[PDB]
Paper text:
The structure showed that Lin1840r forms a dimer of identical subunits each composed of three domains. The active center of Lin1840r is located at the interface of domains 1 and 2 as in the cases of known GH3 BGLs.
Lin1840r shows a similar overall structure to that of JMB19063. A loop (amino acids 568–598) in Lin1840r extends into the active site of the other subunit to form a part of the substrate pocket as in the case of the corresponding loop of JMB19063. Therefore, the formation of the dimer is predicted to be important for the catalysis. In domain 2, the helix and loop (amino acids 435–455) extending to the active site in JMB19063 are missing in Lin1840r. In domain 3, clear electron density was observed. A distance between side chain carboxyl oxygen atoms of Asp270 and Glu473 is approximately 6.0 Å, suggesting that the enzyme follows retaining mechanism.
Residue numbers in the entry:
A (entry chain B), B (entry chain A): 1 to 724
Write the structure that this text describes.
């Protein structure tokens, strides 16, 4: 509908209708839900919600199916005075029913098109089941693998996160101006604004603190990239940002998000985040939480009742302008209009059952393809991998038969539909003997069984990993290790005399030195999703060639954290020419380097790269064009991730030793040679200064081209002169 | 001498004289040195120092004795055109020749007079050997025990650190306006400005980043207290402060230190820190490092040559004003004048050998008394301790005979004069059987020997600990544990069936859970210094009753770091009533609490405290007066540390759940009752807001009175109304 009619709606709503429009509730709080209806009465009484509230609520979170949505929307539209339909939002993080790899695994793909496809299939299925918005992409920069929510991020680099974040928004939304027409696409919600990943000591919900300059340099750019790409919603964070809970942080939400970033869509709170500003100690009670969160521009309160019980009295008393409420209501109505809800409240589902679009073979192949792009081969000593299909496999460990391979933040996917590692391997390999063990125990009886299977077979596939419940939200581990029984298993297996490949399933970096050292090969599968066992079997057999690279550093030990590639030099850097000396930046007990670094991953192929002649000088404002020729010099087709880093050698702020500023994943047949070109615009040479200006300073830069943050050639370019 | 004569010297100096005045050198680079002459020739040539340089240098760093100083000062005044004497500075951190407990241990004293006395004895001795300045106190806030320099701080609380920092300054300097007269006192130098202890991942020299608000709230207050108390010098930090190395950080040093804190004394670089701004990537060469460090107001370059080689040219070219150089030279001369050097360049020694004042028995008693104030009794199950004098002791482990008990940052104290554990115990206990073991090994032969000693004796004193080289500067450990052999030893000893006291020597918080669980008693002696074994023997025997309290949190595990008592609440605090829920701030694998908290320590006595009726309301600006009556209800004389904390319940910034605002250590005979009073001024209720204003907000505060951050009675005070 026309914008005039939208605005007219706001004019016609009562104060109570406008207040309720800013409330989001679980489906079973509404009449006409088809699930959990025995929870309805108790919870409504406990939250003190009336019919007047639920019949005028703005939104539903977490509908259970198309039938829930239709049931609820239908009943809601019977009683709603002005006919303003509900918007339905959902947690579609890395797939709906077809589960794709966890986001941190998709980071390791270094593949924008993989991420777009994942988001596209996700939207196709989610919209089929009646959802209009997804709480994705998660764009929090992560440097602390203790935090369980690292599995939701694409990792430690703000550029990679920015690029994959745009890819995701594109896949979910397509052309954002046509979400009223394109009913298999859905709105995206950027989260969590801001800097939630910097939680102190990796403890869930814990304090975040950094300078404003560091906030702008590293923690804000991916949110911004996604917002500029057209993300329809933004979600507040649970953490403080410089002492003020994000949800009621007026500078953050009005000045930065709506002002500098020009965001004009719905700002939704995280779950209970409005009420929880009380717990943080920055509102005395629900009246203050309401006032402060509305002053900060939060339009939609997720499943708490500060707005509903408090806004009327704040507005009647003069403590809050009713204009702020109108602006909130207008953004809610505009989202709904963007989604086409005023013309079709069922968004394409009424008399059009799309059950058929969910969990198709094509979608499944897309998830397998995403898993084989995202896995990272970490060790492969002596061409153990790929295994011949006649290789006799002892498959042992807790991940041998476990169905827990879909990952965390899997709200709708079912383990019954997933492929476990044994099933996967039995499709490819004729001889497999299986010995499952428990995640946290290694019995005498287990060791006898393991010894017997290994003795029978020729190679060991040792499948280890985390339960998905050990990460995700409020899955903080102080010590980033598997259960000790797993490391003891890897040590035991090593003693049996046969080659060992460890296939590792997990949602965070872990201490894997003891694994690498106890095996011949190590393949990091993360959690690949629905097609996990086929992903594993294809990579092991070489049907697919590993091509992922780490998007997050793997520390030597828990106490190295935070460790990350884009770090400052310090006044006393360790150099090859001072190593051994006391008075340099080092630890007494471990290396400075992480166990594996950013951008690292192996392949069954071998590649040679060469960079075309670059200029020695550049003007201010001028781009550097970087041409790279890459040849596959082996007999095995595969993919390499070309990476380009820049360094600012001297600056008015100490700058990182490297920052990723371009990447492309190149597929090459045996012998095949391609040339790829990168433009590093003057923005790539710029940074935030002490006064928080975005600046380019004349001076020396290094340019690094290669295949990890360590395997690079280096070139120097002197920036100066006049500005273009 | 008169100020007009000081100003006149500046007017008369050549530019080359002025530039060299801003240089500090090791003693052996001066003619007249009486040690390390063999080092002089090569080092002069590598630094490209000539006689016009050394005969005009401003200061000496680390003279080895009174004779070195005299020889150096005599030779230099033969050749110095204008007669400007050298100022001699040294590292007197917790004692000169009589070594007191390490600063972290003095923090655990919670005793201002103990710290004052340590600094007084240190000055008595240091001045007797010809030093004019000490590079103490170290006032860096510490929350990360990986960092080896925690041993130099008084811990994680800015209030405690503030109070003991003032006590040290008062102890070294006395009345600072009479340093030309009181030649047994010396100038103090606050260090390291600023925020060096926040080194990321506890890695030496590594990145520091925090919000400006946090910097003011927690990281600057102790430096400020010591500056306000009259500290003569300040030293720059090695780390970046919001991206800019502190040494050339103009905002920090000009605006904050000289402007806001009104510091008008010498700003000395840390070692090489002027040249190292190059390494940090914020100066291209020595010419820029010099410019920027002089613009930031650094007056004295410690052992690098940026100033001496580049200033003349920067001044001649007009890139740098000669006025900044004159200001530096004037501060350097004012310092020398404050020390009386223009009337007596030898500061009391030239006709007065004060060898007599060094390592006196009186001073050794003060060091013992400081050790028994500072140890912390952590466990004492079944009144194992105190031991009777006739107890038959098996003394075993790496600390049974090690002479390494004087601590890190012991530049001048000698182990031959210290008292090891065996020696201390044999002065008190008639029956001691000793079995020494290595710091990092536990052999079969050791076990046989330990088992035999234990079989013969009735109790085990298991003496464990760190080598001092495992901490201090560039002594970072990624895992805060002793060598695994020591934990294996404690496990072994526990099997022998006799009661065990572990006496632990160390410079940082360690993971001690396994030690607490493997023993009946645990006594944290840190490194007590010269009288270490006597301190140990008195506490074990009850001649002294332990009275120390932790000034830094002891983590459950390395991965809990940072953990500290003055933390924010978060949006989802763990409460005793949401125990067991997933969606709260917690770890899956450990408690949120540290193993032991701030302000905890045991005693051989028992106390009861009672707080007198407090007001329910208070005006803004008004003090709260807190009166507490304490009684020793045991038969044993003892000291208890009464602590008072404040919490700001609701604020415009999320405030810590507690902060210490008053403490007093109270000595009580058996059955003795005392009353003490505390004034919490309105400044105790104040904090820095979003705009960096120091404010007091009306509202609810809680007041906590007790004997730890956990063992408290709580009271509520509503603050508002008018301002008083
Ligand atoms: Mg530059
Ligand atoms: Mg308050």
């Amino acid at each position: 509908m026309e914008q005039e009619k939208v605005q007219e709606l706001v004019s016609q709503m009562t104060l109570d209708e406008k207040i309720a429009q800013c409330l989001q509730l679980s489906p079973f709080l509404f009449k006409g839900t088809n699930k959990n209806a025995e929870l309805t009465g108790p919870l409504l009484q406990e939250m003190k919600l009336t019919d007047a509230h639920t019949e005028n609520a703005g939104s539903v979170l977490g509908s259970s199916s198309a039938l829930d949505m239709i049931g609820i929307q239908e009943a809601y539209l019977k009683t709603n005075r002005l006919g303003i339909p509900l918007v339905f939002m959902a947690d579609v993080i890395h797939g709906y029913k077809t589960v794709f790899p966890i986001p941190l695994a998709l980071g390791c793909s270094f593949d924008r098109e993989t991420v777009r496809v994942m988001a596209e299939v996700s939207a196709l299925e989610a919209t089929a089941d009646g959802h209009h918005v997804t709480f994705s992409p998660m764009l929090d920069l992560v440097r602390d693998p203790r935090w369980g929510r690292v599995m939701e991020s694409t990792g430690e680099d703000p550029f990679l996160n920015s690029e994959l974040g745009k890819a995701m928004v594109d896949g979910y939304q397509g052309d954002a101006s046509k979400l009223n027409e394109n009913l298999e696409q859905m709105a995206a919600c950027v989260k969590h604004f801001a800097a939630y990943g910097a939680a102190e000591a990796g403890l869930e919900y814990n304090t975040v603190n950094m300078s404003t300059r560091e906030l702008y340099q590293n923690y804000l750019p991916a949110y911004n990239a996604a917002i500029q790409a057209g993300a329809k919603l933004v979600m507040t964070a649970f953490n403080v940002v410089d002492g003020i809970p994000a949800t009621m942080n007026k500078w953050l939400n009005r000045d930065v998000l709506r002002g500098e970033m020009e965001f004009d869509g719905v700002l939704i709170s995280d779950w209970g985040a409005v009420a929880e500003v009380i717990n943080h100690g920055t509102a005395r009670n629900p009246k203050e939480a309401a006032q402060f969160s509305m002053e900060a521009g939060v339009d939609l309160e997720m499943m708490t009742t500060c707005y509903i019980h408090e806004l009327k009295g704040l507005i009647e008393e003069g403590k809050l302008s009713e204009n702020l409420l109108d602006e909130a209501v207008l953004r809610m109505l505009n989202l709904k209009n963007d989604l086409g809800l005023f013309e079709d409240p069922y968004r394409g589902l009424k008399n059009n059952d799309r059950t058929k679009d969910i969990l198709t073979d094509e979608s499944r192949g897309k998830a397998r393809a995403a898993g084989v792009e995202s896995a990272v081969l970490l060790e492969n000593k002596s061409r153990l991998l790929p295994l011949a299909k006649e290789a006799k496999i002892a498959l042992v460990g807790p991940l041998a038969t476990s169905p827990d391979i879909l990952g965390g933040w899997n709200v709708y996917g079912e383990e019954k539909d997933g492929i476990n590692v044994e099933t996967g391997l039995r499709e490819v390999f004729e001889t497999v003997e299986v010995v499952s063990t428990e995640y946290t125990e290694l019995s005498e009886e287990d060791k006898v069984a393991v010894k017997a299977a290994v003795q029978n077979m020729d190679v060991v596939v040792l499948a280890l990993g985390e339960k998905n419940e050990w990460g995700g939200e409020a899955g903080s581990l102080a010590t980033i290790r598997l259960p000790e029984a797993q490391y003891q298993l890897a040590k035991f297996v090593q003693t049996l005399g046969k080659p060992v490949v460890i296939t590792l399933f997990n949602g965070r970096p872990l201490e894997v030195k003891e694994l690498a050292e106890s095996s011949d090969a190590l393949l990091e599968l993360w959690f690949p999703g629905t097609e996990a066992g086929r992903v594993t079997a294809d990579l092991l057999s070489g049907a697919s060639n590993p091509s992922g690279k780490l998007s997050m550093s793997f520390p030597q030990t828990t106490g190295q954290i935070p460790v990350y590639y884009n770090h400052l030099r310090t006044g006393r850097p360790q150099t090859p020419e001072n190593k051994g000396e006391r008075y340099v930046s080092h630890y007494l007990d471990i290396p400075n380097e992480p166990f594996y670094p950013f951008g690292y991953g192996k392949s069954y192929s071998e590649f040679e790269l060469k960079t075309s002649s670059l200029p020695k000088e550049l003007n201010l404002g001028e781009s550097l064009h970087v041409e790279v020729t890459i040849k596959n010099i082996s007999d095995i087709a595969g993919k390499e991730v070309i990476q380009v880093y820049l360094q600012d050698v001297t600056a008015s702020i100490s700058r990182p030793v490297k920052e990723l500023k371009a990447f492309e994943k190149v597929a090459l047949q045996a012998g095949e040679e391609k040339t790829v070109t990168f433009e590093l615009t003057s923005e790539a040479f710029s940074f935030y200064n002490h006064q928080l200006e975005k600046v380019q300073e004349p001076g020396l830069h290094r340019v690094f081209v290669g295949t990890s943050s360590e395997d690079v050639d280096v070139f120097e370019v002197e920036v100066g002169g006049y500005v273009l």
